[PDB]
Write a protein that binds this DNA or RNA. Structure first.
Ligand SMILES: Nc1ncnc2c1ncn2[C@H]1C[C@H](O)[C@@H](COP(=O)(O)OP(=O)(O)OP(=O)(O)O)O1
Ligand SMILES: OC[C@H]1O[C@@](CO)(O[C@H]2O[C@H](CO)[C@@H](O)[C@H](O)[C@H]2O)[C@@H](O)[C@@H]1O
Ligand SMILES: [Mg+2]
Ligand SMILES: [Mg+2]
Lengths: 556, 412
DNA sequence: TGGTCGGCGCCCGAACAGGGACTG
DNA sequence: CAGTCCCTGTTCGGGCGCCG
């Protein structure tokens, strides 16, 4: 037994009928070469790595990057070709812990495992496929060939195997210490108890002994006895938390890659900083070719970016979760399909914030978008806290009742109350349920020629009013909308409209207040100005009434 | 030390890989307790990430139960085992079960835990349990026995089952018994009290085999259909006739004998919608003949065992829902309406959920299949809430539709 | 130098599904 | 009765942010 075995390994087959990686090493600069040789030789003394005779016919590239905020270097074996041929795993990391989830604890310890990937044995049979060739200062000296005896960084099975192995080791300690909270994320462990600080450290060291038994070492250097703790990119204080400071690039001239970094930072910021808006900054990224290309900022993306920076000026913080008190989510409409929300328990003390900006559909209204935001908040809350917050919504109780009872789709919002913070969400117009007595009846139709893209839109009415309009570069659908727009333009404040267009009737019955199509927006504009609109549908080509007559006019 | 029937997936088909969805704290606590006991009893055991298959899990409370029931969404696995439980070990369907005055449903799922499961197959029953706020990574398990909600469980256990049954079948040769997944449907024509009593007898028979039985009572003869109906009006406006012609024209895709000619004649002009239009005798007779045809059945509508059932649901408002079950378009095997279900006038999703359950139950009783639902809801709205209202041990297949109603043909 | 892995989030655009209406 | 074209909506993989 030349190399010792420490903890339960995980069987790892190759994908069937496939063989180990072969690919030649990188032209590594000699400066990088120095760092690897010292560490790799050290591994062999521990037993992390073993030398192999050329009987091992596998070569896979290798490279190194400096550890951020450290002088140390990180040793990464590229395994893109080995991943491709290695069996698939099921990832056990189902998400990221959020500090707003955490309950208040009297004593908190954060400890980091050292060489965590290297402390977990790789599968014995699978070890052969690791093989890589070391480099020398010159090309004369060959360099030794090495096979990992433990998990190597850059494999695709490394995270899941480590997380599953780590959980198995922790589980006996957790069962003996039911009242300790251990947040396990990769090798970072967050330990919290209501034990007094002296007793808590006893458990912390006692836990350290337990991890030592399996070869997991927690250095003092990464030990965090004293607040504020640094954990998952947050700063943790006894009663509050915040994101570690975010630096926003100052560039005077913005490329495409610039805006991406900017945007992605602002999304990270919006989890605590209320009211972050990325709409206009993202408008700059639509339909662009080169990540390197330079792009100028519109006066919209500039104003946006201005108030976004000013929100960051003042420090903000979130609080922790009190299972005894209710969860409350409040939502505000920010305009142009932008919504922000705050989740809290004590008024003005936020657990976290967030935004819902997603534009869903070619035609929509605010009530649908509010419903989408409520669902996004509900699922996010269930992940973090396992329950649905009570909702405070800027929509009248009667507005919501009118929408959901009348809509043809099942729709629902969980327990909620009205908050009178403007801008309120409302339905801009309502279609009549029954035909309007004494209102002019417009029979509308339009047709268009598939080849020429030419068409007509027109109407006929019971009073004898008539119109036909020629149109160029159109479609049958567009002319059916146009006919309705014409009837709305040319009618009084109350009007009955009869169409045979299912397309148009479907758009308009869903009461949209915004549309991608300018023509629909204009139809909306008119619907809002009317006092009463009745839309009715008849089947085309059935010899019905006005519909037959207007059909002849537009067909011509 | 019982023989394990070997099982295989349909050829060319890999195992299920379906992400676990977020669970409420209440559900996770129930699952952790349920799985801890099942691990102790050897029904399930923990597994590593090397297994690449996962199936979603969650917990439900059956109607009035108050006691959590573990539930696995095996739809993906069942689709990849499909040939097995149809082409080989399946169960025949008692055409007479729908005719019985009373039918009770029992959860026999526990029995499946007795039998063990093919060692090669257990890799495919893997399920991950999530943690609140991702405190822990996912705790993965797999099944060592026959899992509840898998479609192989009632087939592998059918040999064991019928033996446990046959004594009670022989004491009551008139009682029809049907098995669909975790459920036993027990249909008698007896009076209420005698029926309930015979159910206790079949309970004890399950008890002396070591099976525990924690029931749903149906009345399939009460079940009726929802005919397409035409309004009765003292006077008809132009709009009313336009609505009627549109409904009749659509209906003619189902009943080819519908005629609109004489009713169309009433709308020859370009007329105001509210103008009252007297009916002619010819239209009155055409309308009369039409109402009669709609009372009749569609010609050549018969169930086909090979073809899938499809269920369509429409939200009619005011707590009313309409549904059609069919296999071919416009050849409807049943059409119905539901009213005043749980959640009426406050929760559409709870009501749609209840509707899906009731419709699936009828399909199980009538045809021994579950339909694929065309659900009038937005995918994200359904997925967010449906598990909250689910009280059944099976889960049908569904898809999401967005079609607004140009004609209220089914309700009126 | 340029280069690895898993997770989650956002916003994008392209590729694909499918339902009506109309063309022969 | 196919086969298109519109039009819509979904999915999926790309980039970035963040965590090991
Ligand atoms: N950039 C990366 N690429 C691949 N794997 C990584 C990367 N960063 C971190 N990991 C993995 C491998 C590590 O073993 C594990 C923990 O990260 P980390 O704590 O920073 O290093 P480490 O635990 O090995 O050394 P140390 O304990 O001294 O900080 O997560
Ligand atoms: O509701 C859509 C959701 O279905 C998933 C998640 O459970 O798939 C399950 O439900 C489908 C529709 O009935 C089945 O076809 C599928 O086999 C089953 O696993 C999702 O991946 C999908 O988004
Ligand atoms: Mg570490
Ligand atoms: Mg037309």
């Amino acid at each position: 037994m030349v190399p010792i075995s420490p903890i339960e390994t995980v069987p790892v087959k190759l994908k069937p009928g496939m063989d180990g990686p072969k690919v030649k090493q990188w032209p590594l600069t000699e400066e990088k070469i120095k760092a690897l040789v010292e560490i790799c030789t050290e591994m062999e003394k521990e037993g992390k790595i073993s030398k192999i005779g050329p009987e091992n016919p596998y070569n896979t590239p290798v490279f190194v990057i400096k550890k951020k905020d450290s002088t140390k270097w990180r040793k990464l074996i590229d395994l893109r070709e080995l991943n491709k041929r290695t069996q698939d795993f099921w990832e056990v990391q189902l998400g990221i812990p959020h500090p707003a989830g955490l309950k208040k604890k009297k004593s908190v310890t954060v400890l980091d495992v050292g060489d965590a990937y290297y402390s977990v044995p790789l599968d014995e049979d699978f070890r052969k496929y690791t093989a890589f060739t070391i480099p020398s200062i010159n090309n004369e000296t060959p360099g030794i060939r090495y096979q990992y005896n433990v998990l190597p960084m850059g494999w695709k099975g490394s995270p899941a195997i480590f997380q599953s192995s780590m959980t198995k080791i922790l589980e006996p300690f957790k069962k003996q210490n039911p009242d300790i909270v251990i947040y396990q994320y990769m090798d970072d462990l967050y330990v919290g108890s209501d034990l007094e600080i002296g007793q808590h450290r006893t458990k912390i060291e006692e836990l350290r002994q337990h991890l030592l038994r399996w070869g997991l070492t927690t250095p003092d250097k990464k030990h965090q006895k004293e607040p504020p703790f640094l954990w998952m990119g947050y700063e943790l204080h006894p009663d509050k938390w915040t994101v570690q400071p975010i630096v926003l690039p100052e560039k005077d001239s913005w490329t495409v890659n610039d805006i991406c970094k900017l945007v992605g930072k602002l999304n990270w910021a919006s989890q605590i900083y209320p009211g972050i808006k990325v709409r206009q900054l993202s408008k700059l990224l639509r339909g662009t070719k080169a990540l390197t290309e330079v792009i100028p900022l519109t006066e919209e993306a500039e104003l946006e970016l201005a108030e976004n920076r000013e929100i960051l000026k003042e420090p903000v913080h979130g609080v922790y979760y009190d299972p005894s008190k209710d969860l409350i989510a409040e939502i505000q409409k920010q305009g142009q399909g932008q919504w922000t929300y705050q989740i809290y328990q004590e008024p003005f003390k936020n657990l976290k914030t967030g935004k819902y900006a997603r534009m869903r559909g070619a035609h929509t209204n605010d009530v649908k978008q509010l419903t989408e935001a409520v669902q996004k908040i509900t699922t996010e809350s269930i992940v973090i806290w396992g329950k649905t917050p009570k909702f405070k919504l800027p929509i009248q109780k009667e507005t919501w009742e009118t929408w959901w009872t009348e809509y043809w789709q099942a729709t629902w919002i969980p327990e909620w109350e009205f908050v009178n913070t403007p801008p309120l969400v409302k339905l801009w117009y309502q279609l009549e349920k029954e035909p309007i007595v004494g209102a002019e009846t417009f029979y509308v139709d339009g047709a268009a020629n598939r080849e020429t893209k030419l068409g007509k839109a027109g109407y006929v009415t019971n009073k004898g009013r008539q119109k036909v309009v020629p149109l160029t570069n159109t479609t049958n659908q567009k002319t059916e909308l146009q006919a309705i727009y014409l009837a709305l333009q040319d009618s009084g404040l109350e009007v009955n409209i009869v169409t045979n267009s299912q397309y148009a009737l479907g758009i308009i019955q869903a009461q949209p207040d915004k549309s991608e199509s300018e023509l629909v927006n204009q139809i909306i504009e008119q619907l809002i100005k009317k006092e009463k609109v009745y839309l009715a549908w008849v089947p085309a080509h059935k010899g019905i009434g006005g519909n037959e007559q207007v059909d002849k006019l537009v067909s011509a | 030390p019982i023989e394990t029937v070997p099982v295989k997936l349909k050829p060319g088909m890999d195992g299920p890989k379906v992400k676990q969805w977020p669970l409420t704290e209440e559900k996770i606590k129930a699952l952790v307790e349920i799985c801890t006991e099942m691990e102790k009893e050897g029904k399930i055991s923990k597994i590593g990430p090397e297994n690449p298959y996962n199936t979603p899990v969650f917990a439900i409370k059956k109607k009035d139960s108050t006691k959590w029931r573990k539930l696995v969404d095996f739809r993906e696995l069942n689709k990849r085992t499909q040939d097995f439980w149809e082409v080989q070990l399946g169960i025949p369907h008692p055409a007479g079960l729908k005719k019985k005055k009373s039918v009770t449903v029992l959860d026999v799922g526990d029995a499946y835990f007795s039998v063990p499961l093919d060692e090669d197959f257990r890799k495919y029953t893997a399920f991950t349990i999530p943690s609140i706020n991702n405190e822990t990574p996912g705790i993965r398990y797999q099944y060592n026995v026959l899992p509840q909600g898998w479609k192989g469980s009632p087939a592998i256990f059918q040999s064991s089952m019928t033996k446990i049954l046959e004594p009670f079948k022989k004491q009551n040769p008139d009682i029809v018994i049907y098995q669909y997944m975790d459920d036993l449907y027990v249909g008698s024509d007896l009076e209420i009290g005698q029926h309930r009593t015979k159910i206790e007898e079949l309970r004890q028979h399950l008890l002396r085999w070591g099976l525990t039985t924690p029931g749903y009572e149906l009345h399939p003869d009460k079940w009726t259909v929802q005919p397409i109906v035409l309004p009765e009006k003292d006077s008809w406006t132009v709009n009313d006739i336009q609505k009627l012609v549109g409904k009749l024209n659509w209906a003619s895709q189902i009943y080819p004998g519908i005629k609109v000619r004489q009713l169309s004649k009433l709308l020859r002009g370009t007329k105001a919608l509210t103008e009252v239009i007297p009916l002619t005798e010819e239209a009155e007779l055409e309308l009369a003949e039409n109402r009669e045809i709609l009372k009749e059945p569609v010609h050549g509508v018969y169930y086909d065992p090979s073809k899938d059932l499809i269920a369509e649901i429409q939200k009619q408002g005011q707590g009313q829902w309409t549904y059609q079950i069919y296999q071919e378009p416009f050849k409807n095997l049943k059409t119905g309406k539901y009213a005043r279900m749980r959640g009426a006038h406050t929760n559409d999703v709870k009501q749609l959920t209840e509707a899906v359950q009731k419709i699936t139950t009828e399909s199980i009783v009538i045809w021994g299949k579950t339909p694929k639902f065309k659900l009038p809801i937005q995918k994200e709205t359904w997925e967010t809430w449906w598990t909250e209202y689910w009280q059944a041990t099976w889960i049908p297949e569904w898809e999401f539709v967005n079609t607004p109603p140009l004609v209220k043909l089914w309700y009126q």
